[PDB]
Amino acid sequence: MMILKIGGSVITDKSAYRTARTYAIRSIVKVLSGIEDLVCVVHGGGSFGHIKAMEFGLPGPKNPRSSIGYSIVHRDMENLDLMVIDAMIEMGMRPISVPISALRYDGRFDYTPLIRYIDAGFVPVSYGDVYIKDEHSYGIYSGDDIMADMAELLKPDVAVFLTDVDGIYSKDPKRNPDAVLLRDIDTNIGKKFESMVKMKSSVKNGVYLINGNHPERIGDIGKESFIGTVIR
Amino acid sequence: FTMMILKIGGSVITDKSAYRTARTYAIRSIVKVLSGIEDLVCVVHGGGSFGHIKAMEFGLPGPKNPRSSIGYSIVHRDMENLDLMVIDAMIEMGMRPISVPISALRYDGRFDYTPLIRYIDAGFVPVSYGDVYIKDEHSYGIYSGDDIMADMAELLKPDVAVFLTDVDGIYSKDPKRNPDAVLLRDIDTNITFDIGKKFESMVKMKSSVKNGVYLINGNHPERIGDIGKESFIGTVIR
Numbered sequence: 001m002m003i004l005k006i007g008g009s010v011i012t013d014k015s016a017y018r019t020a021r022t023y024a025i026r027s028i029v030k031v032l033s034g035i036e037d038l039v040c041v042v043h044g045g046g047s048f049g050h051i052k053a054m055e056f057g058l059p060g061p062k063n064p065r066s067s068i069g070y071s072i073v074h075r076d077m078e079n080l081d082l083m084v085i086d087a088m089i090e091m092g093m094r095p096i097s098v099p100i101s102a103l104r105y106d107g108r109f110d111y112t113p114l115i116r117y118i119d120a121g122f123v124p125v126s127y128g129d130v131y132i133k134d135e136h137s138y139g140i141y142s143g144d145d146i147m148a149d150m151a152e153l154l155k156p157d158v159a160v161f162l163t164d165v166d167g168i169y170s171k172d173p174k175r176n177p178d179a180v181l182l183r184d185i186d187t188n189i190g191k192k193f194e195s196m197v198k199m200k201s202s203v204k205n206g207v208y209l210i211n212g213n214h215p216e217r218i219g220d221i222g223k224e225s226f227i228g229t230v231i232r
Numbered sequence: 233f234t235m236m237i238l239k240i241g242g243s244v245i246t247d248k249s250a251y252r253t254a255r256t257y258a259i260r261s262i263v264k265v266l267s268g269i270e271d272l273v274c275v276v277h278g279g280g281s282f283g284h285i286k287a288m289e290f291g292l293p294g295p296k297n298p299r300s301s302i303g304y305s306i307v308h309r310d311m312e313n314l315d316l317m318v319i320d321a322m323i324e325m326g327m328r329p330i331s332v333p334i335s336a337l338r339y340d341g342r343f344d345y346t347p348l349i350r351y352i353d354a355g356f357v358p359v360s361y362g363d364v365y366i367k368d369e370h371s372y373g374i375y376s377g378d379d380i381m382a383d384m385a386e387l388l389k390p391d392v393a394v395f396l397t398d399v400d401g402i403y404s405k406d407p408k409r410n411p412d413a414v415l416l417r418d419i420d421t422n423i424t425f426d427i428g429k430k431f432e433s434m435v436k437m438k439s440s441v442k443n444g445v446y447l448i449n450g451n452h453p454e455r456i457g458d459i460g461k462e463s464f465i466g467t468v469i470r
């Protein structure tokens with residue numbers, strides 16, 4: 001079994017509100033459709049939740065501004081999600097979105113509906129989303145959070161994160177011409193990296209970070225040729 | 233105030249003959265009325281051409297096979313697209329909607345609507361819609377917007393339930409087919425009575441709905457404001 005997250009940095013233009021990279025969505029999903037053991041797909045939001053979230057005070061205390069922002073951020077995320085769902089349906093996949101915003105929550109989310117779908121043969125699709133954290137607070141659960149939950153619940157053999165760079169580097173490669181790709185990380189981007197390292201305890205054969213602009217690399221896992229990072 | 237739940241029929245917000253064909257002005261016009269309702273607790277909508285068309289063609293509801301399974305994804309996708317048109321209008325007009333789809337709820341014979349209760353309690357207007365669900369290991373179901381309205385009457389005990397369709401109310405026969413049909417304005421549930429399934433379920437609902445279940449022409453949504461009034465045009469079930 002594989003679980004996989006598509007980063008918002010690769011399927012959206014993060015700098016421009018509600019701006020998708022449709023060709024990246026299509027070319028990633030074309031590859032995802034050939035992965036036989038792919039049981040769950042998560043994606044991030046990029047410019048479809050982070051801009052309105054900041055603008056409306058999410059995550060944060062409930063007030064009439066964040067309450068309206070909650071509606072907008074969730075709606076925007078559905079719009080992005082439907083573009084991923086459309087490409088999956090085109091490739092003959094059997095996707096079904098299960099938003100975090102629709103799950104029971106008591107401090108952790110009741111994912112029973114995603115598990116039921118996996119058992120019935122669907123590929124549940126979920127994404128970084130708003131939720132009601134408590135009677136006076138709205139949270140944002142990111143796609144990395146959801147991936148950590150899914151690792152713990154499913155104990156998949158492999159987890160893949162797609163971002164818009166080749167892997168985890170020593171430093172942000174966009175700022176730092178001298179940054180070096182880290183091919184292999186052991187268990188003994190900072191927030192993302194922490195939770196990936198922590199996922200490895202639930203993922204038998206590796207948590208990978210791969211360039212979503214090179215989705216074909218998912219199939220090079222194991223080969224010399226492989227370009228990417230593995231946490232192992 | 234009255235606590236109202238309301239269903240927007242697909243017959244009024246879709247062109248039921250033409251696949252994925254919505255009626256945008258009807259949607260905006262209805263939503264303008266909704267945004268002025270003081271205690272609108274819940275909104276449901278049906279699918280018209282964003283559901284019944286594909287569903288029937290894919291064998292939904294029915295046994296699981298690869299056509300109905302792909303069909304499941306597609307019907308749910310299309311339903312979401314229609315729903316988003318409704319959500320977009322509501323957001324444009326100052327409302328706080330949040331979609332809560334039946335296909336994402338736990339089901340064991342009934343649906344666990346807990347997430348929807350949480351949103352009502354938090355001051356949102358949850359919006360749900362007729363949708364696909366896994367009925368058992370071998371079967372896929374379709375839970376219509378009428379079924380969701382029935383679940384909501386019982387769960388929430390609203391004062392009023394309103395169904396919007398593309399005709400004025402229940403007639404003695406199909407109004408579109410025969411020009412001699414007459415509008416039945418008043419249906420006393422205490423008597424034996426002289427869209428069949430819809431009618432059945434509205435009558436069942438009325439025990440959970442304190443002050444009446446109404447059927448109103450969704451092309452005339454201002455009529456919602458004339459509930460109570462002797463000026464109201466529509467069917468009431470009391």
Ligand SMILES: Nc1ncnc2c1ncn2[C@@H]1O[C@H](COP(=O)(O)OP(=O)(O)OP(=O)(O)O)[C@@H](O)[C@H]1O
Pocket residue numbers: 006007008009010043044045046128142143162163164165167168169170171172173174189190192
């Ligand atoms: N050490 C590092 N290695 C690799 N990338 C880094 C590092 N530090 C910072 N970055 C930046 O992290 C970015 C990816 O982070 P980002 O949070 O956008 O990923 P994402 O999962 O696509 O986001 P989303 O939450 O929208 O899904 C890269 O574009 C890179 O510029």
Ligand SMILES: Nc1ncnc2c1ncn2[C@@H]1O[C@H](COP(=O)(O)OP(=O)(O)OP(=O)(O)O)[C@@H](O)[C@H]1O
Pocket residue numbers: 240241242243244277278279280362376377396397398399401402403404405406407408427430
């Ligand atoms: N006796 C009757 N009285 C009123 N309308 C009738 C009658 N018999 C048939 N109809 C037809 O019922 C239609 C509305 O029923 P319909 O099932 O479309 O409701 P709806 O809630 O809009 O559907 P959905 O929301 O499931 O897509 C009308 O267009 C009308 O032609």
Ligand SMILES: C=C(C)CCOP(=O)(O)O
Pocket residue numbers: 008043044045046048049050053073077127128129130140141142143144
């Ligand atoms: C709803 C928002 C803001 C997106 C959260 O998801 P991420 O994009 O994985 O951080």
Ligand SMILES: C=C(C)CCOP(=O)(O)O
Pocket residue numbers: 242277278279280282283284287307311361362363364374375376377378
């Ligand atoms: C999922 C489908 C087909 C819609 C069911 O809802 P209705 O249109 O209210 O009967």
